[PDB]
């Protein structure tokens, strides 16, 4: 239809004709290649939607009313706002309770886009009550009592009532929500699964605290397990959440080592997939960051040649994230740690990258190379790395760094010639 | 130091995945 010919059936005096004006806006609004949001927006159809999902009786303008909305919120930021202007959170909190359980659907899904928008709306919809409802759909014993696409809608709500920064979420609703995100977290559903994991990802990303709360539920193995599945839109999530607790407390750190998550990273420091081996790669870098006891824990797992694999050869923001891990492992690792990195291979790969012209990668690897020579002070190795680096042509790339124009470059590589190469 | 996603973040986007934020309905 026009937009003139729904304004005319909404605004008939005929139940009927406002039906069937309404089912012609949901599929305007659904319809693939641009649908015209702004000009149902200014034909001022949103406070007519926001009614109809008040009519219990007509249950079928509900539904349709319900399906129009969600599109809308479903759109720009300011498309979002004008639904929330219209009244729409209390009417659709109002339908979560509707025994038709495609319309309380429709409500979990709008909700959901109006949650999903910004950090503010979130915070409105959990004002106005919505959890308390949310949670009471999931409170039976057997979760496979529920549709699939119902229980994934439910899912996939609270996800973004997790998500979001400047301010997190409430602590209070967080609390109220993860029992229920623990169950989802073991469903034997994949997207459920997947968006399990995205809620425990966006709760671990803050404070330790944060992290805390989430690790105190005993959620880690399960998160090791799903770091293990087929689906990449699981093991995606999944690595996150356990990439967001290792940057905590050493402790959080051990209970993602303990639960035996380091097995997978052979094949996740491997993985074809660009965005899993750099976060993989990133990951180690904050265990690496973490205590003599976690560090051996790498090398006795056998990750020591993988992450000289990734610094060798991976694209280049992920040789960076190597590169990061490997000067946290030099600046906490013990002695003999440290001169395994040189047994493993490590300098040649280190002095290739220091062929970038990027200021801040060279002062990493300028700091990883200090690092491992004062190691081989200690045991009387400097010679043999002094051979090694000339060798490979990293002499020939450091001494030049000495005419480098930023003093922190110029001057470590300054350093590194006096002491190691005269 | 540990470094947090927010980091990560800053060096790596665009196109760090994340969840979907909004779903049209088909």
Redesign the interface.
């Known amino acids: 239809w026009s937009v003139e010919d729904i304004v005319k059936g909404i605004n008939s005096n005929n139940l009927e004709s406002q039906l069937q004006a309404t089912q012609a806006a949901r599929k305007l609004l659904s319809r693939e290649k641009q649908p015209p949001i702004d000009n149902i927006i200014r034909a001022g159809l949103i406070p007519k939607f926001v009614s109809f999902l008040g009519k219990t009786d007509c249950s079928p303008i509900q539904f349709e009313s319900a399906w129009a909305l969600t599109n809308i919120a479903s759109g720009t930021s300011e498309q979002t706002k004008a639904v929330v202007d219209g009244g729409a959170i209390p009417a659709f909190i109002s339908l979560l309770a509707s025994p038709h359980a495609h319309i309380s659907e429709q409500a979990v899904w709008a909700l959901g886009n109006i949650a999903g928008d910004g950090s503010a709306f979130r915070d409105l919809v959990i004002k106005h009550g919505a959890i308390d409802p949310l949670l009471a759909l999931l409170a039976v014993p057997d979760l496979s009592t529920l549709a699939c696409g119902y229980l994934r809608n439910l899912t996939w709500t609270l996800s973004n009532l997790c998500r979001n920064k400047n301010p997190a979420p409430p602590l209070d609703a967080v609390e109220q929500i993860l029992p229920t995100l623990v169950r989802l977290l073991h469903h034997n559903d994949p997207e459920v699964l997947a968006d399990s994991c995205w809620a425990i990802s966006y709760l671990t990303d803050g404070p330790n605290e944060r992290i805390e709360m989430v690790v105190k539920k005993g959620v880690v193995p399960q998160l090791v397990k799903l770091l293990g599945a087929t689906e990449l839109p699981i093991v995606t999530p999944a690595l996150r959440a356990i990439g967001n607790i290792v940057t905590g407390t050493d402790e959080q750190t051990q209970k993602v080592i303990d639960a035996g998550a380091l097995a997978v990273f052979p094949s996740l420091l491997t993985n074809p997939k660009t965005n899993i081996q750099k976060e993989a790669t990133w990951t180690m870098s904050n265990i690496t960051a973490g205590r003599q006891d976690q560090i051996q824990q790498v090398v006795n797992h056998g990750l020591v040649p993988f992450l000289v694999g990734v610094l060798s050869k991976a694209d280049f923001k992920t040789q960076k994230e190597a590169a990061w891990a490997i000067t946290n492992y030099t600046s906490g690792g013990t002695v003999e740690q440290i001169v395994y990195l040189v047994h493993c291979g490590i300098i040649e790969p280190l002095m290739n990258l220091l062929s970038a012209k990027d200021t801040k990668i060279i002062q990493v690897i300028l700091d990883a190379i200090s690092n491992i020579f004062q190691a081989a002070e200690k045991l009387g190795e400097t010679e043999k790395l002094s051979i090694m680096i000339e060798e490979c042509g990293g002499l020939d790339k450091i001494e030049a760094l000495q005419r480098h124009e930023n003093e922190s470059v110029y001057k470590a590589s300054l350093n590194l010639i006096e002491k190691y190469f005269s | ?6 980091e ?1 973040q800053q ?2 986007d665009p ?12």
């Open positions: 130091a540990k470094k947090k996603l927010r990560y060096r790596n196109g760090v995945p994340t969840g979907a934020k909004k779903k049209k309905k088909i």
